[PDB]
Amino acid sequence: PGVAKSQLLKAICKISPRGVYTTGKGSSGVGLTAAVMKDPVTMILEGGALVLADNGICCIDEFDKMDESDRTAIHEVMEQQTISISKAGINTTLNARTSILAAANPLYGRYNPRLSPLDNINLPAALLSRFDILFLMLDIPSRDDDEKLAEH
Amino acid sequence: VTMFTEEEEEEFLQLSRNPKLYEILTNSIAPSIFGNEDIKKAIVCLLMGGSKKILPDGMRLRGDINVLLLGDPGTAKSQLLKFVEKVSPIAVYTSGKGSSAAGLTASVQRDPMTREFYLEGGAMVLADGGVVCIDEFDKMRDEDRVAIHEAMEQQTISIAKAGITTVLNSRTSVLAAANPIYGRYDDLKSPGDNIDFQTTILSRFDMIFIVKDDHNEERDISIANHVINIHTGNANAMQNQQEENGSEISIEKMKRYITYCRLKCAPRLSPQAAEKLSSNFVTIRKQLLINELESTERPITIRQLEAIIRITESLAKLELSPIAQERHVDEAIRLFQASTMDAAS
Amino acid sequence: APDAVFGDRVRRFQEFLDTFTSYRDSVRSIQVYNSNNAANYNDDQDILPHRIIISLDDLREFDRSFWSGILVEPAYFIPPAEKALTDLADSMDHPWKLSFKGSFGAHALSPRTLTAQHLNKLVSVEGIVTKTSLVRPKLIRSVHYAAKTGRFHYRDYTDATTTLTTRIPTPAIYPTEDTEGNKLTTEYGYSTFIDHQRITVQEMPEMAPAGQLPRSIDVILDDDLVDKTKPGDRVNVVGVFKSLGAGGMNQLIGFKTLILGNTVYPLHARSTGVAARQMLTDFDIRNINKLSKKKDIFDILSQSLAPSIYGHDHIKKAILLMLMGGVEKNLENGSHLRGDINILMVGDPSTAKSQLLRFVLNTASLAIATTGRGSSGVGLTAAVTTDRETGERRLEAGAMVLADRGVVCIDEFDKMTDVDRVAIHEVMEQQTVTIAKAGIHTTLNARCSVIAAANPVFGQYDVNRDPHQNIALPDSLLSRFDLLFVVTDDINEIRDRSISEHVLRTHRVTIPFLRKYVQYAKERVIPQLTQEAINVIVKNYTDLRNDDNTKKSPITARTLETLIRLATAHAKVRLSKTVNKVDAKVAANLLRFALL
Amino acid sequence: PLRDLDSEHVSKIVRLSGIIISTSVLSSRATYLSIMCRNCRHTTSITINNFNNTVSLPRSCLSTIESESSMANEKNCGPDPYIIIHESSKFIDQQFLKLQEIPELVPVGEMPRNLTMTCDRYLTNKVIPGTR
Amino acid sequence: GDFLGQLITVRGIITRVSDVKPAVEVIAYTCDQCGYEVFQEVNSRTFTPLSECTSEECSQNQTKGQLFMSTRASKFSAFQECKIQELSQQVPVGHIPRSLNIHVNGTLVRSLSPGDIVDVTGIFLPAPYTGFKALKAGLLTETYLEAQFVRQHK
Amino acid sequence: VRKDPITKEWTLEGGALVLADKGVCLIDEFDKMNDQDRTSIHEAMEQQSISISKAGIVTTLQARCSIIAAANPNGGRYNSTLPLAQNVSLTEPILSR
Ligand SMILES: Nc1ncnc2c1ncn2[C@@H]1O[C@H](COP(=O)(O)OP(=O)(O)O)[C@@H](O)[C@H]1O
Numbered sequence A: 001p002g003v004a005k006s007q008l009l010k011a012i013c014k015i016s017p018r019g020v021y022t023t024g025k026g027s028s029g030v031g032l033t034a035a036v037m038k039d040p041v042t043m044i045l046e047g048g049a050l051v052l053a054d055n056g057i058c059c060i061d062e063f064d065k066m067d068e069s070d071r072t073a074i075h076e077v078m079e080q081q082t083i084s085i086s087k088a089g090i091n092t093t094l095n096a097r098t099s100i101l102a103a104a105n106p107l108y109g110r111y112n113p114r115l116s117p118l119d120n121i122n123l124p125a126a127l128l129s130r131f132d133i134l135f136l137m138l139d140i141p142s143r144d145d146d147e148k149l150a151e152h
Numbered sequence B: 001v002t003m004f005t006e007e008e009e010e011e012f013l014q015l016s017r018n019p020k021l022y023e024i025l026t027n028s029i030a031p032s033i034f035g036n037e038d039i040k041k042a043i044v045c046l047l048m049g050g051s052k053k054i055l056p057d058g059m060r061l062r063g064d065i066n067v068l069l070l071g072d073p074g075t076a077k078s079q080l081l082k083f084v085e086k087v088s089p090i091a092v093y094t095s096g097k098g099s100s101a102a103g104l105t106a107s108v109q110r111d112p113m114t115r116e117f118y119l120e121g122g123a124m125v126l127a128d129g130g131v132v133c134i135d136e137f138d139k140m141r142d143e144d145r146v147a148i149h150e151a152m153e154q155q156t157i158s159i160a161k162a163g164i165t166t167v168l169n170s171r172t173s174v175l176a177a178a179n180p181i182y183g184r185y186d187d188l189k190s191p192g193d194n195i196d197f198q199t200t201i202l203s204r205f206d207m208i209f210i211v212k213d214d215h216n217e218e219r220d221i222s223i224a225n226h227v228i229n230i231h232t233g234n235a236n237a238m239q240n241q242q243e244e245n246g247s248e249i250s251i252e253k254m255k256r257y258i259t260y261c262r263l264k265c266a267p268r269l270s271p272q273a274a275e276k277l278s279s280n281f282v283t284i285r286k287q288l289l290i291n292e293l294e295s296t297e298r299p300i301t302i303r304q305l306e307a308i309i310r311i312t313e314s315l316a317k318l319e320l321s322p323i324a325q326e327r328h329v330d331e332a333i334r335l336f337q338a339s340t341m342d343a344a345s
Numbered sequence C: 001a002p003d004a005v006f007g008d009r010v011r012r013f014q015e016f017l018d019t020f021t022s023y024r025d026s027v028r029s030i031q032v033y034n035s036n037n038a039a040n041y042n043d044d045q046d047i048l049p050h051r052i053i054i055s056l057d058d059l060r061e062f063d064r065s066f067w068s069g070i071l072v073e074p075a076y077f078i079p080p081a082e083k084a085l086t087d088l089a090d091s092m093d094h095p096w097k098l099s100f101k102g103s104f105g106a107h108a109l110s111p112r113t114l115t116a117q118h119l120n121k122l123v124s125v126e127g128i129v130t131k132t133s134l135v136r137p138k139l140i141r142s143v144h145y146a147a148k149t150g151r152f153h154y155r156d157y158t159d160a161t162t163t164l165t166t167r168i169p170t171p172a173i174y175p176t177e178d179t180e181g182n183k184l185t186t187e188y189g190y191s192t193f194i195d196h197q198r199i200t201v202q203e204m205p206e207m208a209p210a211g212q213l214p215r216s217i218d219v220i221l222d223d224d225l226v227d228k229t230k231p232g233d234r235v236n237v238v239g240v241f242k243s244l245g246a247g248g249m250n251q252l253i254g255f256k257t258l259i260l261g262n263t264v265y266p267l268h269a270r271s272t273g274v275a276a277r278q279m280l281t282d283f284d285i286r287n288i289n290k291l292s293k294k295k296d297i298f299d300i301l302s303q304s305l306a307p308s309i310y311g312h313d314h315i316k317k318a319i320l321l322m323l324m325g326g327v328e329k330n331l332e333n334g335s336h337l338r339g340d341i342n343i344l345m346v347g348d349p350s351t352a353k354s355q356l357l358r359f360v361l362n363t364a365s366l367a368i369a370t371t372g373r374g375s376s377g378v379g380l381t382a383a384v385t386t387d388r389e390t391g392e393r394r395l396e397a398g399a400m401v402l403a404d405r406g407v408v409c410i411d412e413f414d415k416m417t418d419v420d421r422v423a424i425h426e427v428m429e430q431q432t433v434t435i436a437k438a439g440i441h442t443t444l445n446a447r448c449s450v451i452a453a454a455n456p457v458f459g460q461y462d463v464n465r466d467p468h469q470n471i472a473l474p475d476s477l478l479s480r481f482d483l484l485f486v487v488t489d490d491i492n493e494i495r496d497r498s499i500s501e502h503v504l505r506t507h508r509v510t511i512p513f514l515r516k517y518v519q520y521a522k523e524r525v526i527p528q529l530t531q532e533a534i535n536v537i538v539k540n541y542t543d544l545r546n547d548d549n550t551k552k553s554p555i556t557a558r559t560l561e562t563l564i565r566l567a568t569a570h571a572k573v574r575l576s577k578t579v580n581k582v583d584a585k586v587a588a589n590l591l592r593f594a595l596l
Numbered sequence D: 001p002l003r004d005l006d007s008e009h010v011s012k013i014v015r016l017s018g019i020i021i022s023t024s025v026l027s028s029r030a031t032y033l034s035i036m037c038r039n040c041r042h043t044t045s046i047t048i049n050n051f052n053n054t055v056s057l058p059r060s061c062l063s064t065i066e067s068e069s070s071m072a073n074e075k076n077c078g079p080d081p082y083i084i085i086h087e088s089s090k091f092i093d094q095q096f097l098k099l100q101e102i103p104e105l106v107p108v109g110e111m112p113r114n115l116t117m118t119c120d121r122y123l124t125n126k127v128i129p130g131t132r
Numbered sequence E: 001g002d003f004l005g006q007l008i009t010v011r012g013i014i015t016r017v018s019d020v021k022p023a024v025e026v027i028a029y030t031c032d033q034c035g036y037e038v039f040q041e042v043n044s045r046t047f048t049p050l051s052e053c054t055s056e057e058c059s060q061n062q063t064k065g066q067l068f069m070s071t072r073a074s075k076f077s078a079f080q081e082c083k084i085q086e087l088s089q090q091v092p093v094g095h096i097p098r099s100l101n102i103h104v105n106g107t108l109v110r111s112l113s114p115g116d117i118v119d120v121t122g123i124f125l126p127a128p129y130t131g132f133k134a135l136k137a138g139l140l141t142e143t144y145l146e147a148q149f150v151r152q153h154k
Numbered sequence F: 001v002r003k004d005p006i007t008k009e010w011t012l013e014g015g016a017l018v019l020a021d022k023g024v025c026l027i028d029e030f031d032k033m034n035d036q037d038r039t040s041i042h043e044a045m046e047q048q049s050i051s052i053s054k055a056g057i058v059t060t061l062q063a064r065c066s067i068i069a070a071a072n073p074n075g076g077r078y079n080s081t082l083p084l085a086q087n088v089s090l091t092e093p094i095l096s097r
């Protein structure tokens, strides 16, 4: 945890125009997508954050703790512009030019070589196949790397 | 009603200086229930309420005590807890956490008109400065049990729901009555082994009593033929009326008597009685040290001393004087040892 | 022309206003400051209202008649005294209102029992601020330009609320085509306006009975008194209970009531709102300046906070430091760097764990006790508004939102579900809460300090099995908390002796001096790091990575961020401006007892 | 019992007993009041006793009905001119309780019935609802 | 509420943007008998159609005309509005952010995406409106802001 | 506390055990009864009086019913040699009462 990834996660959606910072549970499966409410003075589709943050980058915390239905929408973004809705009166397939940054934490404990890749991962590899680029945030306590970081 | 007449003060003072006063009140609770003479004692001191120190030190302590009535069915402890409400001026009887429509903990319901937040109800808000009767503590739902696990230490259940952030007072007194698994087999195991979660719940209490059932054929007739006379022709109730000529002239008089005893007197112990307890609390802890190390396995608390120290003022509130004596304390150790003989074995 | 009655109330109160010269220097300082306030705004480049606090003390020792007349029929003595007071403002150099501060056992009753009695009197009411309405300005004076004549005009409008006397109502239609037929072109800006607000006050829940339906009344505010209260506080209100309106006798009950002519006083709760109104005299701070010139006062303040608890020396030392809160330095166009400190303790029961908590609550300021579950609105606001004025969505500030710049008391931390624990990573690390539901996605700020308390999993097994997984908590929550205190169950006789006479003398320098010394250090004592602060902790933190990992775990760079905070809060106690090496010598020892 | 209240019991002294549901929020009627004619400048005062619709403000300035020559010699206050000077008036309470019949006997086939209450001055703020 | 009529500068977050729809300003009216064109200016929220004719030549005559409006001769205006939430940085320590109504007219429309950071400058005018009927204290003025210039951060 | 769709005011509606005071109530299928029902039957045979804590109301209504059951065995028509408390799926205190 000591890499301070969220220092960069707030920084990216800050400089970049059309940048919405999102969390895990604070949006549900209906929150970040659109919704239908009664219009004021002027029954339109009130959109969510991914509806808002199109042609921009969405910053996402704790994808491990989403809803399982909320995972299904994310697979629907890996094919572009597709958000399908089959609710009570809505059949829309709205478009979205969004961009995805995700950051999840590993399993209980930290970096067991006895554990395998996908053993310390709480997501199926078909989702990992949709990720072109993946990083790992190691923390090896090394003697020589500290003094520059301490002076930092 | 707080204030009252002068002749009612005087008839209290006549009853006050009787040296048989502890005995006559420990013959006052259950003429309907034969036996349970130690249980007959421990009910009284709980109904008095101990001291309450509101020191310049940032916290206050607690006055009321809590007693468990774990044991076999057929005890007529159900009949006993009904009589507890009859003694108490205000008290709430609960079987489990659930009544038919009444909750037990601090519920906050929004008013459907005007959309207003108010205190809906429960039990601890109601019986503030009174008696709480809870049945089936271990057969109990456990979503709000933590609120019960705080009220018996600070008398102040805090509520931090969506509307308000208030801290109220609730100076109630809880009487627990658990139910062992498999009856007398709970004493065939280790003396815990009732609460499936753990027995650290039991460490937060004071007095623990075990109800047994040992067959004795002459006692079997005496426990029977005592109660047949209760039923028909109200003969023991008529026998009460000649005891009414000599002892315990009313329930509701004693009800008013406790209320005058509670809020008036400000008792305090004696410093030479403190060195008796320090010589006693160490040696029991030393005995618990010996029974730990020789049996090489594992409970006494410092709240056990907090249980010891409060029985004196309950007996002092009987005695109505603000001071204490040596034999004024030493009677409780005999009664408290009855609370610890159930503990070890 | 006034009658003889009106001038006699003036000259009698003018006699009182000439009697005591304390209020003379008050209005003098009002005029001189606002003159100097406009002087600096209009000389280099090329606020305060008009009301003065008068106690309810001196009127009893001056005029018991004029005492009595106010307390029954205030609608005869309030206008001439203000007219006499505006005379004093004009003579020594606009409403110029007053306060009527003062405690009286006459009419300090509950609002629950207020109705139908003591009407048209002055009543002091306290209670709960709820459902605050919107701030609107009010039209008073209209300005009109006529085109062809080229002149302006003049027109006023009044309502029955302000005047306090039932005067003959004369409505006037908003003007158009006045004299000959020139168009009355409207203007603005020079047309004057005054804000306006109405609110409802529920009674005190601590004063309330066990359970019954609460009943309330309404209060309309005035110009300098709009928006002093958020909904959800405890506020005393002093004003006049007035009933207006034609009570149904025109053509089934009229005579709706309200209270006007008001002063607003927010008061401290047990767990809500500000308690920082505590004064500091020069006599007070001279004692603090005499106190801070010593060398061992950290020990005395450490031993002070256990008034009835034996032991736990190094635990109490941090409880000073959390209320110090550390320093905050937000970066230039970057992010903030978190300064406060969050601690969890663990130990066996009946070992002063619950004997610590309200002491943390009552001594500190703006604390909220959070017990058991925290579901649906503790860390959130839930946005549930069905506001009848318009279809819209607003917020109701939750406890984690409400406890900003304060302390959150978490009781029985292990019984919390994993649902709200998602928010705790968001709260404790980014110091913000973003709520994104389908109505409005939001973002707010909360930088609370956190103390939680969890139990062991099973038994008292605090040392027997292994130091790891006595809690079985998620892994990042180890990194969230700064120090993890373990309280043992050491059985002795010398230790039992120290327990013995402590509790015995219990049942048979100070706290109010302390919180004066605390809140003074917040606004002037922040320090700045010096060169000597580097050289020790660089050598020390390498030892923390090289050899503590051979004993326990984990070691992140986040731990070094706490090493900054400990030396920071220690310099706040000594009120130094630099940072000394000794502050690190204290801070280095604090990790050893907390871990090893 | 509440079950049998015939039309022969209209406006007669009838007692009963039941269970009180819930109170209301206290309003206020008026008893004594001073008024003013908004044209004539004519003031009187009105007291009432049986306030339990009954009376309202009159519709004439009433200075015309005067047994004096020089005042009746000196227009129209009309229409209804009276505006209540509220600064010197007198007020009372009004309660509106609500009572329900006792459900122990005969509400078996039906739903329970109820009535509508109203109490006077010292009778307000008396009873916590629910008792017998 | 003392800054009414001034020219100001605010900033915040564009929230709940409405749609652009035309606002009618003045309506033409063809006589069809006298052959004039009647013009009615509306500055209120709602209005009414007018009478059979208001000519000078249809006047002082027995048989007046009967009119009807026209679409292509009227003048319209681009209209759309939105709400601005507080910047959430200068908010006091225990408060909840409010909102504010801003009307936008004419050329500057279709220039404000929701959820942004923008400097809005304009002039501060009331609108004739009060809330509930019984809560009216007699002169209740509901305000708004008219947009004049957009300067966006980012 | 419920309102009536025939009439809209709040009316207190006691239970059938509130109704059957000095009467006999007939309740069956105890296995398909909730914990809401199960606390009610527990309190009713306990002290013959039902307390409530609704909106602004706290009363204690009495109940002197007599309960006659009609159960349903679990699985088999008569399960095994195992006793009735083992045969039934209910609890011990309602068996005691
Ligand atoms: N010593 C006794 N004297 C009188 N009655 C008794 C005695 N012991 C038991 N009873 C009877 O036992 C019954 C109470 O059962 P009880 O053990 O209280 O049930 P539980 O404790 O399981 O709720 C009462 O009806 C009472 O008549």
Ligand SMILES: Nc1ncnc2c1ncn2[C@@H]1O[C@H](COP(=O)(O)OP(=O)(O)O)[C@@H](O)[C@H]1O
Pocket (backbone or CB within 6 Å): B302, B303, B306, C308, C309, C310, C311, C348, C349, C350, C351, C352, C353, C354, C355, C356, C502
């Ligand atoms: N060192 C001590 N000095 C004085 N009293 C103590 C000490 N340790 C425990 N106590 C007693 O323990 C009680 C508090 O129990 P506590 O440990 O706070 O509850 P829990 O473990 O359930 O959170 C207090 O009444 C206090 O008298």
